[PDB]
Amino acid sequence: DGFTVLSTKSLFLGQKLNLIHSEISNLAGFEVEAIINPTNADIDLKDDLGNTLEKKGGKEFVEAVLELRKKNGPLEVAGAAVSAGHGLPAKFVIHCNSPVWGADKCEELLEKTVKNCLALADDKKLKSIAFPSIGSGRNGFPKQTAAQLILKAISSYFVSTMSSSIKTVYFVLFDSESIGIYVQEMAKL
């Protein structure tokens, strides 16, 4: 397949969390309704993932984001916004502007980003969403802290949003260490 399931876990309300291994690049061809693209204020798709979403999407999809750039403007911190996934199997791509490690209140802001992306899914009544590795790399969060926070916010959303469109959330990771941490953390419930 290119995608192999490494872990599972139901939450208190019955949503499934799946850990998947794959290169950041294959994410675009992954069968799931929404996909989270962490970029920046300018939603310029200028990194492996951005680029590969552009190759699998064609002009259709690149135009669609430039629309999203006009209509929305510069994306704020913890901001999330949508585009149609014209080329891809995903219906929508949820672009988000995560905070930077060492930013003021950056941990809450990372929780806030995650919730915003989830809100966006529910509001487009979507059934399954895939996270790649957020906060790590360009934003310099410690891998472990990012995973703690992200998992905490997701767990916090379903408990705080009584009935949601969202049935399945996937984590698509490539970094061996991050995989380790995610498996450990998912075992905390």
Swiss-Prot record:
Summary of the tissues where the protein is detected: Widely expressed.
Amino acids binding a glycoprotein: S98, G135, S136, G137, N139
Residue ranges occupied by any Macro domain in the UniProt entry: 4-189
Description of post-translational modifications: May also be polyubiquitinated. Ubiquitination is mediated by the CUL3/SPOP E3 complex and does not promote proteasomal degradation. Instead, it is required for enrichment in inactive X chromosome chromatin.
Signal peptide coordinates: none
Top-level taxon of the source organism: Eukaryota
Subunit-structure text: The nucleosome is a histone octamer containing two molecules each of H2A, H2B, H3 and H4 assembled in one H3-H4 heterotetramer and two H2A-H2B heterodimers. Interacts with HDAC1 and HDAC2. Interacts with SPOP. Part of a complex consisting of MACROH2A1, CUL3 and SPOP.
Protein name: Core histone macro-H2A.1
Species of origin: Homo sapiens
Gene encoding the protein: MACROH2A1
Span of the entire protein shown here: 181 to 366 of 369
